[PDB]
Amino acid sequence: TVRNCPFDYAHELEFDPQLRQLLTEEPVSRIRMAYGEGEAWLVTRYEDVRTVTTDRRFSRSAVLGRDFPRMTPEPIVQAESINLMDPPASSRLRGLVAKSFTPRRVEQMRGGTQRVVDRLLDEMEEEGSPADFVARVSAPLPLITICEALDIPEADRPWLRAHAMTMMNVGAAGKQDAVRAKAELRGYFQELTADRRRSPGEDLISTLATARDGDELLDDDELAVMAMVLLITGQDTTTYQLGNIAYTLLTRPDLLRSLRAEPQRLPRTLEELLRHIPFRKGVGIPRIALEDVELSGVLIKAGDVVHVSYLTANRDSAKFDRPDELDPDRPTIPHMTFGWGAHHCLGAPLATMELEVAFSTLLTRFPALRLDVPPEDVSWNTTSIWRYPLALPVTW
């Protein structure tokens, strides 16, 4: 009665058939994952994911100390992270970093991001066709963006990203590498944040370090971990989504033609691309039931582990008509690709702006952009919790 879920489906950007079957046939189910102990509930329907991520009887703080069902042999989350805080404690720190991503703030960052994108595309154009869109655009843009915000020295950026990637590996033998990568990244940020708290500058880390409401909002360890979390989160999914969206556009000719004909369609089209693309393998950080709760007729016991699938929520026909169709003109309904509820993505406005600047500029600068290989020759990542193309040869 307990499903085996290695969550290793990795075929292109096709939806995981196991996740689709559970959404359809067993929407609240018991699963066993690659690592951690015991079973977990898996919640798949949009309305039920909405419940689990907002109802205060499902807790992230209670995950602390558990060897919880998960996809990587060492957990990516850290003890002091915002991910493992509950409201109202999580609200104050979420509100603090959200201040750095207000609508005025990201629109004041947009000019600088436009200049980065212009330079990346200049360099790609100078090297000449064909090129790897991953190496030239999707990999560098988010790393530059978050490292400029955190004021990270350019010389350190490859080392930081390499360590973050090690933590995302699902292979069992990589556990000790992942433990070491997490410890070395934590040490880097403990030292860096201590320096910025001691001697503040005008960067984001200094802003977080000096924030007070009587006491400092972040103690020394919370500050170190928050800077580390912002680096890690800022440079993975946005890189992978730039690549996933590029592949999708370059293999959907009517959709790409529509964006070339009417570029003002891009913001709404990007929202539908985000809803549709299965950008991760499996499921992420669970929650713990704090007491017995009957979720859509299923009794979840106090202490049980509860996982949500945002990917199945995005394909729930109860919410999205013809959910497997990529339809940029469909009625607008909030998707779950940035999560939901108390832990909704803090970087969503920044990621959205990066996607809009990159693709709006790409589409006008390279009107003959095409994939330079048959789509089936594109290789897709198997080693990570994320889904992404390893390389994307393009011509123009």
- CB of residue 225 to ligand HEM, shortest distance in Å: 11
Nearest to 237 by CA among 166, 168, 156, 150: 168
Residues in touch with ligand HEM (CB under 6 A): 53, 82-83, 90, 94, 146, 229-230, 233-234, 237-238, 241, 279, 284-285, 310, 337-339, 343, 345-347, 350-351
**How many angstroms separate the most distant Cα atoms in the chain?**
62
Nearer to ligand HEM, 52 or 369 (CB): 52
Nearer to ligand HEM, 23 or 150 (CB): 150
Nearest to 148 by CA among 124, 168, 119: 119
What 3-state DSSP class applies to 29?
A: strand
Task: Report the alpha-carbon distance of residue 83 to residue 60 in Å, rounded.
Answer: 7
- CB of residue 368 to ligand HEM, shortest distance in Å: 27
Which helix (H) or strand (E) segment holds residue 294: the answer is strand 293-295
- CB of residue 215 to ligand HEM, shortest distance in Å: 21
What 3-state DSSP class applies to 201?
A: coil
309 CB neighbour count, 10 Å cutoff: 26
Nearer to ligand HEM, 174 or 234 (CB): 234
357 vs 98, 113, 363, 364, CA distance in Å? 21, 7, 10, 11
343 is an annotated ligand-binding site residue: yes
Nearer to ligand HEM, 91 or 379 (CB): 91
Task: Report the alpha-carbon distance of residue 78 to residue 231 in Å, rounded.
Answer: 14
- CB of residue 1 to ligand HEM, shortest distance in Å: 26
162 CB neighbour count, 10 Å cutoff: 11
45 is an annotated ligand-binding site residue: no
- CB of residue 173 to ligand HEM, shortest distance in Å: 27
Nearer to ligand HEM, 326 or 373 (CB): 326
Nearer to ligand HEM, 338 or 366 (CB): 338
- CB of residue 28 to ligand HEM, shortest distance in Å: 17
367 CB neighbour count, 10 Å cutoff: 8
* Integer-rounded Cα radius of gyration of the chain: 21
- Strand pairing report for 28-33 and 3-5: parallel
- CB of residue 127 to ligand HEM, shortest distance in Å: 27
- CB of residue 374 to ligand HEM, shortest distance in Å: 27
186 is an annotated ligand-binding site residue: no
Nearer to ligand HEM, 107 or 127 (CB): 107
Contact 10, 281 (CB under 8 A): yes
Long-range contacts of 119-125 (CB under 8 A, 24+ apart): 121/361, 121/362, 121/365, 121/366, 125/365
Got the DSSP string for 341-394? GGG--TTHHHHHHHHHHHHHHHHHH-TT-EESS-GGG--B--SBSB--BS--EE
Nearer to ligand HEM, 82 or 246 (CB): 82
147 is an annotated ligand-binding site residue: no
The phi, psi pair for 318, rounded to 5°, reads -65, -25
Residues belonging to the binding site for heme b are 60, 94, 287, 310, 343, 345
Residues belonging to the binding site are 60, 94, 287, 310, 343, 345
